[PDB]
Short mmCIF file of C-alpha atoms in Angstrom, two decimals:
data_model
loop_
_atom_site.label_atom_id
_atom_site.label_comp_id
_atom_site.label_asym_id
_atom_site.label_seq_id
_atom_site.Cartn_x
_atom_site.Cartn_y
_atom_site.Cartn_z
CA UNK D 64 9.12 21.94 13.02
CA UNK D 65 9.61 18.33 14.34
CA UNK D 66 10.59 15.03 12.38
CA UNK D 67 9.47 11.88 12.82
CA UNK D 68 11.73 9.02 12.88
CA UNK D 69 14.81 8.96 9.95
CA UNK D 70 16.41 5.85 9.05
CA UNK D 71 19.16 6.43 6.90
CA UNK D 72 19.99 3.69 4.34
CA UNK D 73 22.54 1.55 5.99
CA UNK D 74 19.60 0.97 8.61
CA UNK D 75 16.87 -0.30 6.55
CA UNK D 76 17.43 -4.25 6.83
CA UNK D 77 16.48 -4.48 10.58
CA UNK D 78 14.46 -1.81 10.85
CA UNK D 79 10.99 -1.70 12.14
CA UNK D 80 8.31 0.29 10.00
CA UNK D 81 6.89 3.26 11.91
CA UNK D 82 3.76 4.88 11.27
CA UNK D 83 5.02 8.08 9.33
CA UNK D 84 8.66 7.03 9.72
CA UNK D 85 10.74 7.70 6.72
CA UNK D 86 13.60 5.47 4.90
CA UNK D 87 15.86 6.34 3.63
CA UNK D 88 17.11 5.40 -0.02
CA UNK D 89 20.48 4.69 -1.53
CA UNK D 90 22.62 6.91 -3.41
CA UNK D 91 24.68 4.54 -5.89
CA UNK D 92 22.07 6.01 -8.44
CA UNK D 93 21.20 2.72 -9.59
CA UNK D 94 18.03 0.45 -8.76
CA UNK D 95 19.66 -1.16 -5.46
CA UNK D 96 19.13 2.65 -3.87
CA UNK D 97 15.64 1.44 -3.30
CA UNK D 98 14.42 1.49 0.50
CA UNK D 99 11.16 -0.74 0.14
CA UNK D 100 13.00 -3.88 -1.17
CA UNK D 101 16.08 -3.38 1.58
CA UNK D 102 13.35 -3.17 4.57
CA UNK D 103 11.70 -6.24 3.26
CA UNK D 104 13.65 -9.14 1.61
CA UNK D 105 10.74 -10.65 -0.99
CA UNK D 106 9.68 -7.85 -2.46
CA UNK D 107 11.11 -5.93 -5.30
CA UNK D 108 12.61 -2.64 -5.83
CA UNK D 109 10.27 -1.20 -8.67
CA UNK D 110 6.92 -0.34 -9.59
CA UNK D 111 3.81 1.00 -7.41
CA UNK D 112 2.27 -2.22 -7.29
CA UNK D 113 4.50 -4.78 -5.66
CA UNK D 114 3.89 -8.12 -3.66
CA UNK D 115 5.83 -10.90 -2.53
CA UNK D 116 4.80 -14.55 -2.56
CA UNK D 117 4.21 -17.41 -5.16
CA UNK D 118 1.24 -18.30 -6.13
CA UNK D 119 -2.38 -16.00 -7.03
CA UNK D 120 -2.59 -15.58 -3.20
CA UNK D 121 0.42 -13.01 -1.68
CA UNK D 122 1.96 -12.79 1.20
CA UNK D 123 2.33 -9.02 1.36
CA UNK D 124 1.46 -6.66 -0.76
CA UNK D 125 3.09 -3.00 -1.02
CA UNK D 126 1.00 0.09 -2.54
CA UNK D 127 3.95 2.90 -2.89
CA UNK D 128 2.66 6.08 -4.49
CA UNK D 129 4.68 9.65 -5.48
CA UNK D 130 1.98 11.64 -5.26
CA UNK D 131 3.47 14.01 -7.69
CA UNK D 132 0.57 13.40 -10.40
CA UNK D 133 -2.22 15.63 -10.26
CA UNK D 134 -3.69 13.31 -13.05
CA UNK D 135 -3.92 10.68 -10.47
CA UNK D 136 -4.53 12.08 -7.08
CA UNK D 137 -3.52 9.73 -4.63
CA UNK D 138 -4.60 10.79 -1.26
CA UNK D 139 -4.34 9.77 2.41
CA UNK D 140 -7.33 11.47 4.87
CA UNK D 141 -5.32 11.10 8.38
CA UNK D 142 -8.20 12.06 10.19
CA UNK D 143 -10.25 8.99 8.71
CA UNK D 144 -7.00 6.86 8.34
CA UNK D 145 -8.47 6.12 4.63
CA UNK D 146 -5.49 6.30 1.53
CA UNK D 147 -7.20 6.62 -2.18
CA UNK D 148 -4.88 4.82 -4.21
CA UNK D 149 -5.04 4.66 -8.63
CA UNK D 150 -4.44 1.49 -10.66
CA UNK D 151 -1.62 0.73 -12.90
CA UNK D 152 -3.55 1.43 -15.74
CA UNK D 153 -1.99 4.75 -16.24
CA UNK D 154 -1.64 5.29 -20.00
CA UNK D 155 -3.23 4.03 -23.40
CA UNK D 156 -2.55 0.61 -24.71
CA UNK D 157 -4.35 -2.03 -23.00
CA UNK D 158 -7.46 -3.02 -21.20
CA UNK D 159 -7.74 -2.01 -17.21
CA UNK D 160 -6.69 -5.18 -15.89
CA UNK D 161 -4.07 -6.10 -18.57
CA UNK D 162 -1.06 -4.47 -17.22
CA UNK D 163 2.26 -5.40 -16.49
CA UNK D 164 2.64 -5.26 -13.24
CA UNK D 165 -0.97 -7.03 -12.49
CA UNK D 166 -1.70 -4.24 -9.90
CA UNK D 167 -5.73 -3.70 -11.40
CA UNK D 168 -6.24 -7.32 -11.73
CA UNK D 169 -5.19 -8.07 -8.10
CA UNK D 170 -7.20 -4.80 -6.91
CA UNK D 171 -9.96 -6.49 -8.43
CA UNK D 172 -9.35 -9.48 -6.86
CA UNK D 173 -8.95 -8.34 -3.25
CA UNK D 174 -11.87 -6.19 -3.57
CA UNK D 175 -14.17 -8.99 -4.64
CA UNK D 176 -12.99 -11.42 -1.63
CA UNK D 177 -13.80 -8.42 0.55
CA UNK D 178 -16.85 -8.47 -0.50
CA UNK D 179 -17.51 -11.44 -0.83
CA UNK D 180 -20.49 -13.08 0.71
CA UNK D 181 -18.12 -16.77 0.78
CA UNK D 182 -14.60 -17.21 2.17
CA UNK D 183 -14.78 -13.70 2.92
CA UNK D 184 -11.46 -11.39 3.00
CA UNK D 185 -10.21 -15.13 2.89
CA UNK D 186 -7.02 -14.05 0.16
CA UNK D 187 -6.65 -10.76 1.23
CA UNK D 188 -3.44 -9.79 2.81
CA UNK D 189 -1.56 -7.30 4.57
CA UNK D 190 -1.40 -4.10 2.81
CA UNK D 191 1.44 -1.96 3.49
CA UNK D 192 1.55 1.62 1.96
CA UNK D 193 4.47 4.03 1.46
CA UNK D 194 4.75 7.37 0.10
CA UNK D 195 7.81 9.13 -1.74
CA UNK D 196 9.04 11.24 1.10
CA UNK D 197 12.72 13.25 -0.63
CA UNK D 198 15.45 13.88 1.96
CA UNK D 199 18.15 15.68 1.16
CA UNK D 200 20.28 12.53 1.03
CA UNK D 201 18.28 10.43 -1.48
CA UNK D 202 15.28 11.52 -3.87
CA UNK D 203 14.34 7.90 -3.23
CA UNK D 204 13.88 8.07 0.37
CA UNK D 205 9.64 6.62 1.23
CA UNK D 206 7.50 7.33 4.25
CA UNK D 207 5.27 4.25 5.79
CA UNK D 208 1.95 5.33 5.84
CA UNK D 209 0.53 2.41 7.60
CA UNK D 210 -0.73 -1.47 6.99
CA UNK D 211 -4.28 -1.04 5.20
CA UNK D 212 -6.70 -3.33 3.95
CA UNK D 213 -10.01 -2.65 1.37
CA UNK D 214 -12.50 -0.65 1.37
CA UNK D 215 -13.36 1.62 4.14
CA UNK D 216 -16.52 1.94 6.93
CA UNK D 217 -19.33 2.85 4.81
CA UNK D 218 -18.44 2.75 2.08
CA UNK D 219 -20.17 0.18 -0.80
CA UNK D 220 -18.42 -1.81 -2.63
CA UNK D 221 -20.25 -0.05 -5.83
CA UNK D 222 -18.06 2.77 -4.45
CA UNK D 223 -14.96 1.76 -2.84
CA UNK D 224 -13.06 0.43 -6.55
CA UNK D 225 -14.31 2.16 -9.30
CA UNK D 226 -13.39 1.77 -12.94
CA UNK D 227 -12.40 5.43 -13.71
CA UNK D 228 -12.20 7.24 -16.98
CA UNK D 229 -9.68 9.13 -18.69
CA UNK D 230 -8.33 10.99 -21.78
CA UNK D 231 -4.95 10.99 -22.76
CA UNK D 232 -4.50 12.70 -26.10
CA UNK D 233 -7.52 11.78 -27.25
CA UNK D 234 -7.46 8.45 -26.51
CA UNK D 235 -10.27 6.92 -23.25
CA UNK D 236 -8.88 4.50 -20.81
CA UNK D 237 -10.10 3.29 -17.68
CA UNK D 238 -8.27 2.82 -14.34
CA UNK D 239 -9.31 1.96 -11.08
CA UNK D 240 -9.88 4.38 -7.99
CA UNK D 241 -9.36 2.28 -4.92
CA UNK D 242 -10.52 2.75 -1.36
CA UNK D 243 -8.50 1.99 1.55
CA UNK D 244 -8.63 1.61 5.34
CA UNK D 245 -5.96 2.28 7.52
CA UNK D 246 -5.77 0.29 10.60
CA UNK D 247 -4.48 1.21 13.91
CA UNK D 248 -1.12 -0.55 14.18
CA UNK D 249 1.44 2.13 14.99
CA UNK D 250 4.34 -0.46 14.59
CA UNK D 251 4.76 -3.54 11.96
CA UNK D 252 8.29 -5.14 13.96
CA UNK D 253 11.53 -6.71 12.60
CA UNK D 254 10.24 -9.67 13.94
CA UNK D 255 7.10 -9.81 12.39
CA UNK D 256 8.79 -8.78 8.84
CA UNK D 257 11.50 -11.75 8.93
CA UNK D 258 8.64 -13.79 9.69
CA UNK D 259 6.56 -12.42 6.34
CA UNK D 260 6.08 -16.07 4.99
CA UNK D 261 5.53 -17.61 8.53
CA UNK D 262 2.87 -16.64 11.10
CA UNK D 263 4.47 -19.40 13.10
CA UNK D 264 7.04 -17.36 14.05
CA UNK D 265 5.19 -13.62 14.02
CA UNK D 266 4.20 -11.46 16.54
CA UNK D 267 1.50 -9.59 17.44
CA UNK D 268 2.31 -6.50 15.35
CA UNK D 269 -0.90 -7.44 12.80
CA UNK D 270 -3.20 -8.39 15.63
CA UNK D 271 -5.65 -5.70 14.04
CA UNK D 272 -5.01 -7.21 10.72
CA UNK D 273 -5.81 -10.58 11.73
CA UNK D 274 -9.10 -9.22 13.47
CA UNK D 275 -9.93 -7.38 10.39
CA UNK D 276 -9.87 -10.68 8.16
CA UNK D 277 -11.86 -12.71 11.23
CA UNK D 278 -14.56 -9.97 11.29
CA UNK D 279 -14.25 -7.47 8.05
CA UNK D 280 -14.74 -4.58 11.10
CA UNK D 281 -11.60 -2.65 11.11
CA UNK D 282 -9.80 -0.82 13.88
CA UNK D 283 -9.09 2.39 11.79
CA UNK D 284 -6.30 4.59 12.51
CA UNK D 285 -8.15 8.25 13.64
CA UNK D 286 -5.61 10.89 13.99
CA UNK D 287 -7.21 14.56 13.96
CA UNK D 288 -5.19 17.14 13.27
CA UNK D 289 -3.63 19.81 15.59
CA UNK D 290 -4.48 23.81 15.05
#
C-alpha cells in the first residue's frame, strides 16, 4: 500500500496543494486545528461551502465534503475527473437558496454564468475541492481533490445543478445536486496561493483554469484506474 504526499500540520502555511495530497489538521481540539484555512490565509476554517473575497464575485472558492452521509452522496469519478457535490440546504427550515452559509445561492449563481449565453463563465472562479481524509494524528486532516469548475462535458445545464428533493421526518426540502469538472492541474503552488487576490503576481499553476474561463472547454483530469 503506498501514500501519497503527508503534510503534517506545522507544514500547511507554505505548502503547495497536491492532487490527492493530504493535510494534515491540528490537534488543540479547537477550531484553529483546521487545515483548509492554515493552507490558505482568506478563507475560513468552517463550513462546506467557503470562499474568500469581498464582494458577490470571489476570489476562491473551497467545496470540502466528509463524505460520511449516505443521505447526501458526494462523489468524485477519477476516471472522468467529475466530483458530485450537495448544497447546503441539508435540513428543514428554509427555502434552497436561503441558507447560512450562501453555498446554494452562489451554486446557482456560478452555474448560470456558465451557462450563460453573455459574459460567459465571466464570475466564475477557481474551485478548489477537498475531502475529509482521517490520519491517525488528526480526525481533521483533508485530501485536495483538485481545482474544478461547473458543469462537466456533456452534460446540460438542465442536468448538471438540479434542485433535489428530500424527506426528513416528514417534512420535503429541496437541495441542489451539483456537477463538477476536474481539470488537469496536478499542482496549485505556494506562489500562486499567496498571490490568491493578485494574478499580477501568479503563476502558471491555473493556466487550465484560465483557458477554461477563455473557452468554457475544459482540460479534464482522466485518471483510469489500475487492476
Amino acid at each position: 500500500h503506498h501514500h501519497g504526499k503527508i503534510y503534517s500540520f506545522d507544514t500547511l502555511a507554505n505548502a503547495d496543494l497536491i492532487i490527492d495530497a493530504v493535510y494534515e489538521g491540528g490537534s488543540s481540539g479547537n477550531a484553529s486545528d483546521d487545515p483548509i484555512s492554515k493552507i490558505i490565509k482568506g478563507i475560513g476554517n468552517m463550513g462546506g461551502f467557503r470562499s474568500a473575497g469581498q464582494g458577490i464575485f470571489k476570489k476562491l472558492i473551497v467545496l470540502y465534503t466528509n463524505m460520511e452521509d449516505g443521505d447526501w452522496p458526494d462523489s468524485i469519478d477519477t476516471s472522468k475527473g467529475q466530483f458530485i457535490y450537495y448544497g447546503d440546504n441539508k435540513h428543514p427550515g428554509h427555502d434552497i437558496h436561503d441558507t447560512p452559509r450562501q453555498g446554494n445561492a452562489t451554486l446557482k449563481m456560478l452555474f448560470d454564468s456558465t451557462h450563460n449565453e453573455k459574459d460567459a463563465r465571466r464570475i466564475v472562479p477557481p474551485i478548489f475541492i477537498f475531502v475529509k481524509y482521517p490520519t491517525a494524528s488528526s480526525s481533521r486532516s483533508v485530501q485536495f481533490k483538485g481545482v474544478a469548475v461547473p458543469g462537466y462535458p456533456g452534460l446540460s445545464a438542465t442536468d448538471d445543478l438540479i434542485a433535489v428533493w428530500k424527506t426528513t421526518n416528514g417534512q420535503r426540502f429541496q437541495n441542489y445536486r451539483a456537477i463538477f469538472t476536474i481539470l488537469n492541474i496536478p499542482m496549485v503552488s505556494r506562489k500562486w496561493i499567496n498571490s490568491l487576490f493578485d494574478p499580477f503576481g501568479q503563476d502558471n499553476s491555473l493556466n487550465p483554469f484560465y483557458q477554461w474561463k477563455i473557452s468554457g472547454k475544459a482540460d479534464v483530469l482522466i485518471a483510469p484506474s489500475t487492476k
